[PDB]
Amino acid sequence: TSIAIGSAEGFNQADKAINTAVKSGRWVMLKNVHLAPGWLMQLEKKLHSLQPHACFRLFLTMEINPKVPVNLLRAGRIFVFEPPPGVKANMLRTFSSIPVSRICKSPNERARLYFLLAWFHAIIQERLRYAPLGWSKKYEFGESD
Amino acid sequence: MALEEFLKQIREVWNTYELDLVNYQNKCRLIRGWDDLFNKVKEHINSVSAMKLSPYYKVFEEDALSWEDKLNRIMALFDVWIDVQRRWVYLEGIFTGSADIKHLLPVETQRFQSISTEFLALMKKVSKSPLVMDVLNIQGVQRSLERLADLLGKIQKALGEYLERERSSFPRFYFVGDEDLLEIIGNSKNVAKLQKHFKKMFAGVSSIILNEDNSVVLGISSREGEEVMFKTPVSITEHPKINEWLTLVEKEMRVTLAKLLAESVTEVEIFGKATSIDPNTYITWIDKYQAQLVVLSAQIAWSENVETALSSMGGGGDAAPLHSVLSNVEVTLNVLADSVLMEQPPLRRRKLEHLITELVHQRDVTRSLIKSKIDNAKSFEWLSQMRFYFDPKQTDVLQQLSIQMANAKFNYGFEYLGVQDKLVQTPLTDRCYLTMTQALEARLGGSPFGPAGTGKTESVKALGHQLGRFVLVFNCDETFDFQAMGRIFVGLCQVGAWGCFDEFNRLEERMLSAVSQQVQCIQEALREHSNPNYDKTSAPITCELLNKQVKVSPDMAIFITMNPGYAGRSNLPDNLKKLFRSLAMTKPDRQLIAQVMLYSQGFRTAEVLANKIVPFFKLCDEQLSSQSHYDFGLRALKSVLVSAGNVKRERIQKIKREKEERGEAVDEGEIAENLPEQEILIQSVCETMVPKLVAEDIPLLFSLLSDVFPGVQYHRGEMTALREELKKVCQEMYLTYGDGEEVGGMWVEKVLQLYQITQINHGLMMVGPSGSGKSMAWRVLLKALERLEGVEGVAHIIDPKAISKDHLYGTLDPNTREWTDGLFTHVLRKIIDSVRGELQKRQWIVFDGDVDPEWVENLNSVLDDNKLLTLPNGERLSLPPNVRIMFEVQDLKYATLATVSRCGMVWFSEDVLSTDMIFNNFLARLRSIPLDESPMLQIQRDAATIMQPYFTSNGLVTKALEHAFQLEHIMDLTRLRCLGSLFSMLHQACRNVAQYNANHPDFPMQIEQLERYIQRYLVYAILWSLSGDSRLKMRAELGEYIRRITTVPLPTAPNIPIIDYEVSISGEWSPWQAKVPQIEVETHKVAAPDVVVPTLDTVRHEALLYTWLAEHKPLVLCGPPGSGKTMTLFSALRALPDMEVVGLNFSSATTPELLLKTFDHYCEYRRTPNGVVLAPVQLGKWLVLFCDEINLPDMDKYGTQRVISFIRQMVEHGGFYRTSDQTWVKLERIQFVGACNPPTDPGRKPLSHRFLRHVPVVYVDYPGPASLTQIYGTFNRAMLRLIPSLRTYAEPLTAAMVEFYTMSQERFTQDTQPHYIYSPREMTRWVRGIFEALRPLETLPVEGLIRIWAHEALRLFQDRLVEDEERRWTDENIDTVALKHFPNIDREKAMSRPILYSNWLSKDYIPVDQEELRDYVKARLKVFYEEELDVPLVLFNEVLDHVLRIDRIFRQPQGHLLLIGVSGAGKTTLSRFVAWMNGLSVYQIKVHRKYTGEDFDEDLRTVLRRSGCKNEKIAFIMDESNVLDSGFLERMNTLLANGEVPGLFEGDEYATLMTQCKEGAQKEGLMLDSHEELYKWFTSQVIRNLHVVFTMNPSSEGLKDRAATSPALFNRCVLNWFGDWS
Amino acid sequence: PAWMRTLHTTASNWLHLIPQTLSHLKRTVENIKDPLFRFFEREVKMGAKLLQDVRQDLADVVQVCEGKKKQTNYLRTLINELVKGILPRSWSHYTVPAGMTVIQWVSDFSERIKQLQNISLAAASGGA
């Protein structure tokens, strides 16, 4: 169950989804939780006094923001998502994200096109590291592109 | 006897005029002829009012006044009757035609039945006696309608959930407001009333065509008159209910257009791939079909020709028939170009313009295809083009047309678009089409982004109109929340309409994240349509919106347009951004847009004109100076280009009009040959660009014009007709009119320029410094147009920043989701509804106030070509053509390009309004308007002749004004603040002469004495009006400058400034010192709050305050805290009876609502025939609002103080808007006085120049050393009469007081600590403190006097000090000063360092030994432990001093304490212990995690009742931690200063308070029954009994910030720095 | 205070580096028709106003740091920026690279005024 956080109804839905999930092993993902720093503190206290199902997982999506409470950060395990360190890492991430059956369809030339796209996507993204020379501006070339 | 005839005519009209009755469905007899009734009543009301001016009105005064009452009563009744009858009609239809509502809402249905019974009963009475007078005499008919209106409104607001149910049955109702929907549902039989609502539910359907019966819908029509006739008409009889035949109309609109398209495609194919086109046949085909289908047919034919040509080129080397496709386009475009070179019908001409724009693009695409040697239909350069495939063999007519771009395929929606202006199809627009259609195929949203004026919104609509979709534009703001967006999505999804959300990043970031969930679920539903496995004969696709299953039409789409460069905007979360495909639209192709538009309008030299106009705009943006009101973007270019076509059409009409009276040589083809096309373009540029230019840019732009358009001259039309009316209106308004270089000529040009902008723009700004003539320019123009054109002009003036943005536009209820209109929304909706003929009048909505992006960007869709006010409830209000949106502002330093580019600009400079013009206006009014309410006018006229020489250009006043601007003033100096002050003072001088004539009925003042008085008073008035806000040195310097240049006789003293002289009524200079006697003050009034010792400054300031106050002119006293501003104002008010002062204490958090509570308590709102009037409750009294800190209220990030804008509105407009009912309220007998510290002081903001022009400022400085000696030497002489043996020491005691006070004021300043302010207030407390310690004493040695003097100095100067060094300095210099002025005294007995005074060991306040005091406090602490608080305390020396300091404050009236120190130092415990020793009850608010503002208000009521009604002495001890909200201190700031909170007791609380006050005052023996008298006694009890102790920790940032939030904490509370334990 | 003495030297030094004179271009009937004059007139007009404002603000800061005029709200805001080394927002009138500090702006502003003086000197002595 995926929930955006900003709405007042989102807070009510998040609590019900979490309460249902902790008794069934269901997964809950809450996105943009950095937009509600005050509610995040109350969620950390709620999670502390809880013994959910062994399969239950709670995912919190946020930007890297100083508003995120320290107490929540200590209670959870942090994973940083950022541009891949280089061309090799960028292209390996691309080939893992795209299912194999996607590339391996009937036209055999489809595989080389995806490689060219992966190389092109890596070169364009890596040039952003050179803020001014690679591109005049810091464009958000990303996964959607 | 002409007056008698008018009365006879009025009597005869109303003895026969009957309410015109019509049967309504055999139920009652409604009333028509509202226009006839209202105009007839207004006509007699004006005639009765006008005949009062006639001198013969006295004989018929009573009869005319009787008719004024009757006519006013007729207006008040039928203005309510019309709204009651209107509401009953559609409510009766709903509660009769839908039996389901009776079960759904039984309570409302029965309640409506009861009201519907009383309405029908009153209808039957009207039927018996339809005569208006008989209806007017029906008992309680006025109150019956008032109850009917209120009751019917409650039923209306109770049908909201029923309306939400009907919106599902016809989803286009989701875009209609609740009231309009009730009109639609309830009037389902009266179809003629449905016509005004179709523009809200349809893209281009403005009305429907009906048969004579109104039972069959024959077709639909657009706002321009274009009609679509249905192939199969829709019968309303066979489908009676509103939502089914409306659905059938929507379907027949789509089916008819598709059938009409097939017929059009058949004919247009003949024109395609044809060598020659006959214009008559082609024009016939254009006229036969609708504008949207004509362009659609042309696109279909061109696409199939290219497909045919590319198919033949399959071999590659085969000959190219693409040239024939180009050839056909060339031939067709030549016929279109020839057609627009001559006169055409307006609908056909626009159709021809659309075809030219379409074919120019087809010509460009075909040329690109030929140049690129494309020979295959599957080539991407052809697939990337937008193509149109038509299959006549397709069975479903709605799917015969397929629009394909790249891989994206679309069906045509066949929404009737009417005649929508098309965009020039530029390469940027081509790229926009490709990107957005890729997003549509991917079931993603489109996100065009870029700076303002790049075509983002128009391109989205153009693409939607290309696909035949209903495109809805929403001007988003922060009020578009999750619930509002979802409901809009529900309407969009079911209708199948496109949502273009502009300024989408103006939503809050939390709302953007929440909305992303709704956008995603719709997009998943959209992909279910695209699934080939899904079959149309199955369950409809549905997504979950707002916890409901909502059907999704495949045609709906979501688009967001944003300016990512605007600072302060919300950043979109990434999960939302992945749902949209973004395209940068940054550089519009201006030269192509200009070339195609000029070519489509018929300009033969369009290529030459486009190559000049587009670079010219580029040059203007760089060659001209930089101004915030300058725009040379695409909107400005588009405005000129559109105006160019309008100017070309009028010249052609003018040329042939000359030909009608000169021969019969109409040769239209040759008429276009000799047509100055360049001169036409220059006229459009000058009519649109010139009014925005500053003076030094005007020659620059004409040099640029000569550079790009050589030999082309601009000549304005000499508008004699308008200028004659303007000249007459100026005469009636005492204004100066000029022509050319005459006086007032520049201003008249700006009025004419403003008129030109009103004819080209529906939104315009008048920008210029305060006092530039902007207001008079549009007020005079509005009246002149009424006389010239016969159309009544109505102006609604709004101060947008004087109210909250919620009160300007409205609010959506968080829970009930009910919409309440704001001020602007209510005004615009009233004009659209046109209940009282507002659509036939010129309606100007003037936003007079500051412009900031927060509120004006809600008008982006209003000010652009959309002309729509979009509300978060989904409602869209169209701007009627008779409405102009105007913005009168002094600057645009916070407006963004988005706003500036969307509005016509007229720039006013301060040179436009010359000082000679202002002088003429003052003299003209002085010679015509009597000041008394003629012997008074005769005095003014003679005085005007005397003043006239000095008010000429380069006269005394002009030279004085120029010199004054060179001086330094406590506030910023503006021309109108000086002249406004100067004219008020001169009016008082005229009143002085009249008052003298009253004193001398025998010998009135002669001209020689009148001349002798006026000249000196004018000099006197000039000095105070131009330097009264400056220091003495600046006041002096203006004196010598006047002395050099004036010829008025002046005082001949060698070194006495002129400002030191008044003007006696005998026309002689008299020194102000003659009115400053050395008084002896009664010994019991020593340093009392009401006692003022006359000084040179006090008598001058009081006289100046008297003049401004007597004229009801708002004024501000400015000076350092404690300089005597309140003292001087209240002293002047004592000499001015019939004026009640009410003190308001502004803080940083003060809003207009503080003023409104004061109005609620002291004033009443009364309904008058001319509107609501707010007047003081007490009759015959002028109520003075005294604001003590008028420049503390918080300035927002856009430089605006809301309360200041509110006060400016009440002064300049004489009123304000009541936000509850959106009604203008007029003030009567209410004036304003301000007090403040200099704006350079911390926490103080400069006052707006638009507020200062009305408010003269007097500077009250601290009294000098000699003035202080005179003031407190008088007090010391009186107080030392208690002990006759101490009379000799009066002078040294005063000298020591002044010396130490001056030294302390220099030593400690606000730079070190924010509370280091020393003023004569300390001197007043110093004398009072000594006096209180001397009253019960029969005798005292001089050493005893010094000890009291030293003790009070420590309490007043040392107790606030923070540092030990500062306290050491104060302790040392007290000894130094005392021995300097008191030699031969025993130092030890008088200055022993432990100086302690107490009344605990005796009856009197006498010195106490430290050890004796320690034993007493231990003895009392023992009792305190057993009775109040068993917390043992260790007694050290500082505690003994502290408890004595707290004891002093609890024994003073309004004794408030500010205890500052570290937590746990005993501040609260000592306060409770001293409170228990003085008999004071301790009150502490019992805060908790859920303690809120209304909990604090109830707690405040409890304490005030006990101390105000029960005479209970209370120590209200409250800590800084108790302040859980800033609103807590706004209440305490008022309570500390005034002992009252104006809005704390309301409703039943006030009624209970009055009962308790009456009981409380009875126990005191006072005879009080009046509520006002009871409230004053209650305030006086709170003043003497309530003691507030404020405890806070030392925080440097917190303490400085604390002063602005609660200035009363630092000037009404005694501060004791307990600090930390030493 | 230590800041009061250090800021006094800096402001006095800046008044030495920054030039003091900038004469507006004399508008003439045939100078208005010259495009170069039209652009160059704008440069001095906006340049002269900025030059006077900065010099006046710096002179007030020096006088404040000598204890001769009382600190106003504007001076308190300006003095706080100068202590922190942030370029005052009032001084910012021509576009500059982001992250430019006040010490570089004063040197940059001084060079721009010198060029503005030479342009006006040529127009005054020699014509447009």
Ligand SMILES: Nc1ncnc2c1ncn2[C@@H]1O[C@H](COP(=O)(O)OP(=O)(O)OP(=O)(O)O)[C@@H](O)[C@H]1O
């Ligand atoms: N044409 C005129 N001839 C004579 N007096 C004029 C004329 N126009 C304005 N005035 C007077 O000069 C002053 C100008 O006030 P006006 O309201 O026109 O200025 P404004 O620029 O709209 O003001 P603000 O900036 O405060 O909104 C008023 O005292 C007005 O009576």
Ligand SMILES: Nc1ncnc2c1ncn2[C@@H]1O[C@H](COP(=O)(O)OP(=O)(O)O)[C@@H](O)[C@H]1O
């Ligand atoms: N391709 C075009 N052809 C004609 N007029 C255009 C074109 N693009 C933009 N305009 C005009 O430019 C102005 C600004 O367009 P608009 O869509 O409001 O811009 P934005 O949404 O970027 O602020 C309008 O007058 C609009 O009609």
Ligand SMILES: Nc1ncnc2c1ncn2[C@@H]1O[C@H](COP(=O)(O)OP(=O)(O)O)[C@@H](O)[C@H]1O
């Ligand atoms: N001529 C005077 N006669 C009596 N008191 C004076 C005189 N001049 C100054 N004062 C004292 O100066 C103080 C001014 O208080 P107030 O009028 O409230 O000041 P402000 O309005 O400037 O804050 C009072 O203590 C008042 O008694």
Ligand SMILES: Nc1ncnc2c1ncn2[C@@H]1O[C@H](COP(=O)(O)OP(=O)(O)O)[C@@H](O)[C@H]1O
């Ligand atoms: N003079 C004192 N001797 C002993 N204990 C004290 C003394 N002053 C304060 N305390 C202790 O500190 C506590 C807090 O006192 P309180 O008046 O609430 O402090 P404050 O108002 O400075 O925060 C008291 O309850 C007491 O235990």
Ligand SMILES: [Mg+2]
């Ligand atoms: Mg837009």
Ligand SMILES: [Mg+2]
């Ligand atoms: Mg005005």
